[PDB]
Motif scaffolding. Structure first.
Motif, PDB file in Angstrom:
ATOM      1  N   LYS A 280      -9.563 -15.520   0.575  1.00 53.02           N
ATOM      2  CA  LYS A 280     -10.094 -16.792   0.071  1.00 53.02           C
ATOM      3  C   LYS A 280      -9.045 -17.907  -0.004  1.00 53.02           C
ATOM      4  CE  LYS A 280     -14.355 -15.948  -0.475  1.00 53.02           C
ATOM      5  NZ  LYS A 280     -15.498 -16.854  -0.205  1.00 53.02           N
ATOM      6  N   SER A 306      -9.820 -18.277 -18.966  1.00 56.17           N
ATOM      7  CA  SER A 306     -10.506 -17.022 -19.241  1.00 56.17           C
ATOM      8  C   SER A 306     -10.269 -16.097 -18.073  1.00 56.17           C
ATOM      9  CB  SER A 306     -12.016 -17.251 -19.404  1.00 56.17           C
ATOM     10  OG  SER A 306     -12.588 -17.690 -18.183  1.00 56.17           O
ATOM     11  N   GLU A 307     -10.525 -14.809 -18.265  1.00 55.05           N
ATOM     12  CA  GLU A 307     -10.504 -13.883 -17.142  1.00 55.05           C
ATOM     13  C   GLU A 307     -11.495 -14.339 -16.083  1.00 55.05           C
ATOM     14  OE1 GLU A 307     -10.031  -9.392 -17.655  1.00 55.05           O
ATOM     15  OE2 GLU A 307     -10.531 -10.037 -19.679  1.00 55.05           O
ATOM     16  N   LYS A 308     -12.670 -14.780 -16.527  1.00 53.13           N
ATOM     17  CA  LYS A 308     -13.718 -15.204 -15.602  1.00 53.13           C
ATOM     18  C   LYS A 308     -13.272 -16.316 -14.651  1.00 53.13           C
ATOM     19  CE  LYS A 308     -18.542 -16.467 -15.271  1.00 53.13           C
ATOM     20  NZ  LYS A 308     -18.466 -17.882 -14.819  1.00 53.13           N
ATOM     21  N   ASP A 309     -12.418 -17.219 -15.127  1.00 54.38           N
ATOM     22  CA  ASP A 309     -11.969 -18.333 -14.291  1.00 54.38           C
ATOM     23  C   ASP A 309     -11.315 -17.810 -13.020  1.00 54.38           C
ATOM     24  OD1 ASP A 309     -12.881 -20.398 -15.933  1.00 54.38           O
ATOM     25  OD2 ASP A 309     -10.923 -20.824 -16.800  1.00 54.38           O
ATOM     26  N   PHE A 311     -11.931 -14.947 -11.425  1.00 55.45           N
ATOM     27  CA  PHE A 311     -13.028 -14.492 -10.585  1.00 55.45           C
ATOM     28  C   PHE A 311     -13.747 -15.677  -9.895  1.00 55.45           C
ATOM     29  CE2 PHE A 311     -13.551  -9.924 -11.384  1.00 55.45           C
ATOM     30  CZ  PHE A 311     -12.742  -9.738 -12.497  1.00 55.45           C
ATOM     31  N   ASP A 312     -14.002 -16.740 -10.646  1.00 58.08           N
ATOM     32  CA  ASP A 312     -14.657 -17.938 -10.077  1.00 58.08           C
ATOM     33  C   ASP A 312     -13.875 -18.559  -8.913  1.00 58.08           C
ATOM     34  OD1 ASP A 312     -16.919 -17.924 -11.667  1.00 58.08           O
ATOM     35  OD2 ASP A 312     -16.073 -19.307 -13.155  1.00 58.08           O
ATOM     36  N   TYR A 313     -12.560 -18.678  -9.053  1.00 61.46           N
ATOM     37  CA  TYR A 313     -11.739 -19.226  -7.962  1.00 61.46           C
ATOM     38  C   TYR A 313     -11.969 -18.500  -6.635  1.00 61.46           C
ATOM     39  CZ  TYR A 313      -8.894 -22.307 -10.946  1.00 61.46           C
ATOM     40  OH  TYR A 313      -8.453 -23.296 -11.812  1.00 61.46           O
ATOM     41  N   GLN A 315     -14.561 -16.677  -5.842  1.00 60.92           N
ATOM     42  CA  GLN A 315     -15.995 -16.574  -5.582  1.00 60.92           C
ATOM     43  C   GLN A 315     -16.525 -15.153  -5.729  1.00 60.92           C
ATOM     44  OE1 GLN A 315     -15.829 -18.954  -1.783  1.00 60.92           O
ATOM     45  NE2 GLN A 315     -17.120 -20.384  -2.949  1.00 60.92           N
ATOM     46  N   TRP A 316     -16.049 -14.485  -6.779  1.00 60.35           N
ATOM     47  CA  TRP A 316     -16.575 -13.198  -7.218  1.00 60.35           C
ATOM     48  C   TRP A 316     -17.327 -13.395  -8.524  1.00 60.35           C
ATOM     49  CZ3 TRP A 316     -12.766  -8.401  -7.059  1.00 60.35           C
ATOM     50  CH2 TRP A 316     -12.788  -7.855  -5.765  1.00 60.35           C
ATOM     51  N   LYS A 317     -18.467 -12.724  -8.653  1.00 62.45           N
ATOM     52  CA  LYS A 317     -19.161 -12.615  -9.935  1.00 62.45           C
ATOM     53  C   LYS A 317     -18.254 -11.826 -10.863  1.00 62.45           C
ATOM     54  CE  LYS A 317     -23.570 -13.778  -8.664  1.00 62.45           C
ATOM     55  NZ  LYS A 317     -24.361 -14.852  -9.319  1.00 62.45           N
ATOM     56  N   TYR A 318     -18.264 -12.156 -12.149  1.00 60.14           N
ATOM     57  CA  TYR A 318     -17.381 -11.480 -13.097  1.00 60.14           C
ATOM     58  C   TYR A 318     -17.643  -9.974 -13.127  1.00 60.14           C
ATOM     59  CZ  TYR A 318     -14.708 -10.520 -17.314  1.00 60.14           C
ATOM     60  OH  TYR A 318     -13.776 -10.032 -18.188  1.00 60.14           O
TER      61      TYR A 318
END
Ligand SMILES: Nc1ccn([C@@H]2C[C@@H](O)[C@H](COP(=O)(O)OP(=O)(O)OP(=O)(O)O)O2)c(=O)n1
Ligand SMILES: [Ca+2]
Ligand SMILES: [Ca+2]
Ligand code: NA
Ligand code: NA
Length: 328
Positions: A280, A306-309, A311-313, A315-318
């Motif tokens: 990516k 956040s951890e989620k951020d 994953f977002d970069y 382009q993965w779902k958390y």
DNA sequence: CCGACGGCGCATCAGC
DNA sequence: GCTGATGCGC
DNA sequence: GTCGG
């Protein structure tokens, strides 16, 4: 386990490639394939079926067809009867003895537990401690014991300085009912990516845990990472608890999320996630996620809240920690 | 076909 | 001693 | 050993 015979076979091959062949990319290839097969929700009926999974290719498909038809793999049966391979595979089970050291010991005629015990003076410090606790380090840690260990570490760290935050990660944070070892991520407000306003932040914690007899030995220790041994206290007339491996890692307070993503694992999950990040156009380490310029040079750290951020970069779902293990 | 394969801390060693 | 490579581990 | 370019 639906495909446990297959994943066991692939794991054994991986270990051979790492320990004997010293072929790290084949080791990783076998482990990648073992993991994708482990999460596949059908009992595999053929190599071609397995071949459709990413990480499973032609050679592994063929091995799967042999295993399904015969319950065995002749290549592994051979490896199992090779004295040099067997010996190297064994010696590498001691913490601190890797593929190189194992082969060197075997060349010197050191190839059994008894040989190691006669030759402590040829071992470095890490290896000597690995040998001392060889039996204990092959035992798993029940979650009930991980919880007692958590108690001790969190309470003792708090006594040193109430500003520390210790988080137990690895398989424990992934919800595992038993753990191979304990991984403790540590932060303190005076250690950030911009400055270190206090010395000995890690040391003072290690010292406290040694003082109360929780930490028993040290394999390696620096300013940010401790690798050693610990043990739960036992009660009167009670047999002692086995000694356990413990890792403590001090991470900059402002890079906690990249830090905890890293420290949670699994190893295969992290490799897979970091490889995806590369595809990516990003690079992830325990500190930061950064873009890559067309040259392939990493740019400036991106904001992470956040951890989620992270994953977002890419382009993965958390993925919740529980879904980051080797098996589901 | 073939380059690339995750990324890094600590211990140890070689060369200056 | 320092610098960089290698081994081993997470 | 596998796979995307
Ligand atoms: N090669 C590796 C190994 C580990 N990790 C990260 C860092 C580490 O903190 C975390 C857990 O590693 P561990 O080796 O401790 O393995 P688990 O906790 O998953 O499993 P277990 O202890 O129950 O056997 O995963 C990683 O990026 N890369
Ligand atoms: Ca662990
Ligand atoms: Ca660990
Ligand atoms: Na495939
Ligand atoms: Na080892």
């Amino acid at each position: 386990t639906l495909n446990g015979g297959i994943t066991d076979m692939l794991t054994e091959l991986a270990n051979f490639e790492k320990n004997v062949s010293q072929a790290i990319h084949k080791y990783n290839a076998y482990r990648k394939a073992a993991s994708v097969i482990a999460k596949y929700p059908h009992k595999i009926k053929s190599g071609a079926e397995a071949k459709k999974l990413p990480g499973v290719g032609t050679k592994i498909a063929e091995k799967i067809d042999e295993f399904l038809a015969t319950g065995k793999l002749r290549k592994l049966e051979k490896i199992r009867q090779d004295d040099t391979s067997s010996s190297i595979n064994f010696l590498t089970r001691v913490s601190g003895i890797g593929p190189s050291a194992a082969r060197k010991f075997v060349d010197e005629g050191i190839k059994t537990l008894e040989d190691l015990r006669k030759n402590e003076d040829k071992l470095n410090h890490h290896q000597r401690i690995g040998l001392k606790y060889f039996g204990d380090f092959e035992k798993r840690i029940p979650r009930e014991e991980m919880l007692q260990m958590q108690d001790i570490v969190l309470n003792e760290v708090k006594k040193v300085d109430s500003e520390y935050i210790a988080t137990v990660c690895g398989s424990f944070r992934r919800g595992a009912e038993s753990s191979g070892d304990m991984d403790v991520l540590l932060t303190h407000p005076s250690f950030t990516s911009e400055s270190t306003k206090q010395p000995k932040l890690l040391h003072q914690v290690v010292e406290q845990l040694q003082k109360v007899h929780f930490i028993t030995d040290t394999l390696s220790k620096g300013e940010t990472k401790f690798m050693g041994v610990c043990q739960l206290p036992s009660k009167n007339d009670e047999k002692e608890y086995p000694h356990r491996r413990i890792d403590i890692r001090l991470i900059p307070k402002d890079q906690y999320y990249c830090g905890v993503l890293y420290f949670t694992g699994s190893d295969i999950f992290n490799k897979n996630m970091r490889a995806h990040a590369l595809e990516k156009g990003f690079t992830i380490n325990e500190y930061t996620i950064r873009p890559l310029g067309v040259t392939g040079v990493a740019g400036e750290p991106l904001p992470v809240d956040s951890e989620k951020d992270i994953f977002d970069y890419i382009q993965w779902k958390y993925r919740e920690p529980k879904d980051r293990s080797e098996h589901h």
